């Protein structure tokens, strides 16, 4: 009935309270730490895979090496053209002086 059967003895499984809980949490904490440690390693290297009056240029180091006698969006300034006798970038109208200084337009530096 309601009271005929008392709860069976689980002592066999029973452990000797917050301390027990803390230990178990500590375990989860360490494991999470382990997962995270691996994460930084894996993700980093994971991402790491994708990691590696006239002008003249010789494409030094894969970029135009202007040598003469765009800060804006990266086009090639056209030498011997423009309103400042230096350069002009047909992309957005940046005029560079012979010194290569941006004088007019939207080129930042």
């Amino acid at each position: 009935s309601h009271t005929d059967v008392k709860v069976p003895d689980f002592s066999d499984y029973r452990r000797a309270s917050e301390a027990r809980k803390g230990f178990s949490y500590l375990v989860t904490a360490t494991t999470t730490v382990g997962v995270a440690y691996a994460a930084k390693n894996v993700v980093s290297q994971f991402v790491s895979s994708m990691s590696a009056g006239k002008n003249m240029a010789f494409k030094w180091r894969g970029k135009p090496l202007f040598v003469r006698h765009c800060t804006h969006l990266g086009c090639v300034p056209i030498a011997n053209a423009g309103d400042f006798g230096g350069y002009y970038c047909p992309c957005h109208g940046s005029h560079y002086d012979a010194s290569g200084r941006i004088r007019k337009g939207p080129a930042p530096l």
Binding site: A36, A39, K40, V43, S44
Partner: peptide, 17 residues
């Protein structure tokens, strides 16, 4: 939840390095 923002930030710095 307040500390979660903080927790994430801490781990973020680590992971981002």
């Amino acid at each position: 939840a307040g500390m979660w923002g903080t927790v994430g930030a801490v781990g973020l710095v680590w992971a981002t390095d």
